[model samples]
Target: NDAVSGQPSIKGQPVLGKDDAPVTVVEFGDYKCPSCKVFNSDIFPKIQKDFIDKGDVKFSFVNVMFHGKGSRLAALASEEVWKEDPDSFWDFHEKLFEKQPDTEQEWVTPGLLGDLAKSTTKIKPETLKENLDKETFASQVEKDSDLNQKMNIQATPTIYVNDKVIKNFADYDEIKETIEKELKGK
Candidate 1:
């Protein structure tokens, strides 16, 4: 979280990478999705190396709900994190992806979120944890859920380059091609 509060809720999505980049890249994913974890933790870094570093791509993620409350709770925590400090959202995002456990594990708890917040952001870990129980960001997560349905994201880790849905994460090549074309043309 930041030193300020009362930030107006995001009307759409928050772009963590350069907001004015030439290309818009959105990944619709579930935090608990195994592939999503890989995309966030492994794949994203490669893209960051080239496009994000060169100010060619603006990227953000929308959390999808395909699992249990674990996924929703994670999204809620993310909403709170973004609201707390938009600049801190991606750091917390990467931390969550890095710390993700097996799907069978019920590990999305307030204590876990608090620990993560403490490690990555200025938000008081315990207070940030309690916000999860109070459901302070429930509405924001719900809006993202609605977006998931509206887009018909039938799979986890769906990639959209310039809103051209990639439908699969076959390899980084396809997204790279799309972004390159988008970068040149858009």
Candidate 2:
């Protein structure tokens, strides 16, 4: 009922913040993207505290598959974790971005992902490993990619506040302003 103009409504992806929040913030990102890393590490916390925790906005992350095997695997692992336990998904999501390997290095292996999950939450390592090995969540990853394609997303960290997409990632102030505008509209 709250679908903003131009932007598509959020599908059944894992979301952070209250379900009844007035505004929805969608981020289309790749695990291997440096800019995405910056946004997640540097800017996301404030957004979480100021908007998400306060129940003013909802945030969702949609994985993009442009980064190759490691990216695909990470995305799949994330979906599996979310399916297994929604409560732990954000912790797992944060750890995945925090521990991202260098672009030239092959560090996001299935084994490492399993280990990361084991250390982060109550999820069993074998479950995560088996799912990753079997690519059980491949379709889920593909769905996100399909949405990315539908939106004509050309880059990682494509952020949308309501229906307006952020074209510049220079600072969090612009994003905050957009969020404020949406909040006002409500």
Candidate 3:
């Protein structure tokens, strides 16, 4: 479900968990956002295990290009991988965040991204390299950015649960309570 409007749509998006799950958690994030990395490394694994793995909630990522060229390139690469193999998308997603540079350096080059995808998933390095060079998924990344604009998102790690924005996503307890409330409502 869309966080702003409670509409159900997942076309051309990367998703995790059961499609029929009662609740949905949407994250509008930039690949270069450090807080997003923190969420992925510190909080998301637990959420994945407790909620997504248990079939209680579904999760989706909306890529936002906040960090310029590298961010856009990463988003495009992610979209390419998602199109080729949905099953490997999350792995690639995690890998990108895991390998993110500390100071927004120019480390997310096409070669590096292709190598990361190659090492993390079954996607061939050549295919990834070709697509990245050609900007094959640029339009998809732009679409995600357009959605972010339409939703009035202003930050990197904007999160929402079932059409409601999560103001304090860093607080694990608060997030758990919100998810529990949504579950109880269901």
Candidate 4:
């Protein structure tokens, strides 16, 4: 059920906050990165409250798993949830981040991932298993990875503030400043 032609992309699902929001914050991230975890746990909720919730900006998540197999597996599983139930996509996403490990070793298994999906989406185990059986979903994960590389992405949790890359990830305040500036232009 993919779109026949449009942007040269396979978006999992558009987590539209405000339909008329002037700026879009597109996140190209890997679930395994601590930076990604930090951004999610610390900065993102505030941003969502101040901007996304107020219809100031729209946010979309594009998974880029440069870490290893765990990152890719988790992304593919989440993508299937999105594909099956687009409205529940962000719910699925939040669950993944909530359960994401601080250690790489904790991430390399599929069992934890399946449990996360079931816990979030209330999706039947059989249905979730069936969706995961589709290798194409995993391929989409790889596709996004390649696309990120072609775009010269060198790190995780990279934020595109209105198409321009924010060069700093160490300071969320700096990133917030860029977002605020983008809001002005829109």
**Tens digit of lDDT per residue, candidate 2, span 1-186?**
221236745776879999999999998888888888888899899899889989999999888887778888889998888888889888888888888755567668888888878877788999898998898888998888788877888888888898888876547899999999999999
Which lDDT value does model 4 have at 118? 72
- Please provide, for model 3 over 1-186, each residue's C-alpha lDDT reduced to its tens digit, 9 standing for 90 to 100: 233544434577899999799989888898899999999998888789889999998999999888888888889899998899788899999989999878856777888888878877888988988888888888998888778877777787877788767876688887788888999999
Mark the regions of model 1 whose C-alpha exceeds 4 Å error after superposition.
Answer: 1-11
Report how far residue 88 has shifted in candidate 1, in Å.
Answer: 1.7
Q: TM-scores, in order shown?
A: 0.90, 0.93, 0.93, 0.85
Cα lDDT tens digits for candidate 4, 1-186 = 211111223255446587688777777787787888888888788779888888897887788877777787777787777777777778777777877766667464566667766777766766666666555487767767676776667778777766667676557787788889988886
Could you tell me the lDDT of residue 143 within candidate 4?
69
Positional deviation of residue 49's Cα in model 3 after best superposition, in angstroms: 1.7
The residue pairs that clash in candidate 1, if any, are none
Clashes of 1: 0
Summing lDDT over every window of 10 consecutive residues in candidate 1, give the lowest-scoring window.
1-10
Q: Model 1 Cα displacement at 111 (Å)?
A: 0.8
Where's the lowest-lDDT run of ten residues in candidate 3?
1-10
Which runs in model 3 stand beyond 4 Å of their true positions? 1-8
RMSD in Å for all candidates: 7.0, 3.3, 2.5, 5.2
Over the stretch 1-186, how does candidate 1's per-residue lDDT look in tens digits? 111112122246767567678887778888888999888866788888879888898787887888888998888888888888777778888898888886577778878888889888888887787899899888888899877776777778887787577745757888898789888786
